[PDB]
């Protein structure tokens, strides 16, 4: 009933036809994956804020345990879970539809907590500090996270973060609230720049292509479109200043 409600609809639209819907790549979500040193065909592994699951199908297909994937958006899902169909994986590989901020998981279920380009949503410290409970002792997080590479910056890269998201932070911030969340910094590393470009901005513009021809006139949707065109400006004029960071980190008692 709002512009919002309408809103989400054209979001899951755009993105219905991408790959991914964050920054991200084959190569730097198994980058990850090598410093988790837990895991089991016994495994259980949730991936929050999956969107259709790209990610997830590479995390799905080099680990032996089951996956579950988990958004808000039930359209992603339905996508999530008709790939898992077209790969035979559904013994294994698993979509549901949740929030990330009343996650349906016992306490110490899990092994593995993934979650690309997402946790922004509810804010990197709340989900670190709500999402805790979920992992067994010993347990991995391996989340991606919206980074300053900088203490200083332009002014209106500064304004459109502060407004978009006021949660990001620099790196050796963002290490000390893992620590201080009681986790282990096992790894931590920046993505590179074709996360963004190649695998991301590059293929939205033939996604943007197919949503404008057809919302063709619809204003919303074409507000929502030069969005997505300033986002990409923004990067190729600021991306010295800014990035995603993969942060992996094991819950450990001797933390908290
Ligand atoms: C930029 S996307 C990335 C999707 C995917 N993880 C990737 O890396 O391609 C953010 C995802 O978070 C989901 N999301 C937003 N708020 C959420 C919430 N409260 N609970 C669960 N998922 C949420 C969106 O629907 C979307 O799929």
Same mark, same amino acid.
């Given at each position: 009933k709002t512009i919002h409600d309408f809103e989400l609809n054209l979001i899951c639209d755009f993105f219905s036809?991408? !790959?991914?819907?964050?920054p991200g790549s084959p190569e730097v979500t198994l980058k990850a994956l090598s410093?988790?040193?837990?895991?089991? !065909?016994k495994s259980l592994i949730a991936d929050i804020g999956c969107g259709t699951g790209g990610q997830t199908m590479v995390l799905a297909g080099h680990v032996t345990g089951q996956v579950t994937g988990l958004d808000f958006l039930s359209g992603f899902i339905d996508i999530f879970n008709r790939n898992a169909r077209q790969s035979g994986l559904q013994n294994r590989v698993t979509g549901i539809v949740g929030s990330m901020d009343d996650l349906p998981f016992r306490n110490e279920e899990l092994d593995l907590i993934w979650s690309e380009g997402a946790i922004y949503n509810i804010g990197f410290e709340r989900g670190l500090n709500e999402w805790? *409970?979920?992992? *067994? *002792?010993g347990g991995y997080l391996a989340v991606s996270e919206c980074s300053w590479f900088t203490d200083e910056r332009p002014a209106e890269i500064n304004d459109f973060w502060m407004d978009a998201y006021p949660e990001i932070d620099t790196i050796p911030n963002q290490v000390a609230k893992i620590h201080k969340a009681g986790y282990l910094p096992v790894a931590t590393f920046i993505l590179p720049e074709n996360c963004w470009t190649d695998h991301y901005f590059t293929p939205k513009v033939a996604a943007q292509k197919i949503f404008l021809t057809k919302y063709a006139g619809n204003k919303i949707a074409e507000e929502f479109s030069m969005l997505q065109s300033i986002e990409e400006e923004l990067y190729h004029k600021y991306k010295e200043y800014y990035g995603y960071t993969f942060f992996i980190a094991k819950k450990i008692r001797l933390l908290e």
């Open positions: 036809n991408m !790959e991914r819907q964050g410093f988790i040193d837990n895991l089991t !065909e805790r *409970k979920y992992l *067994k *002792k």
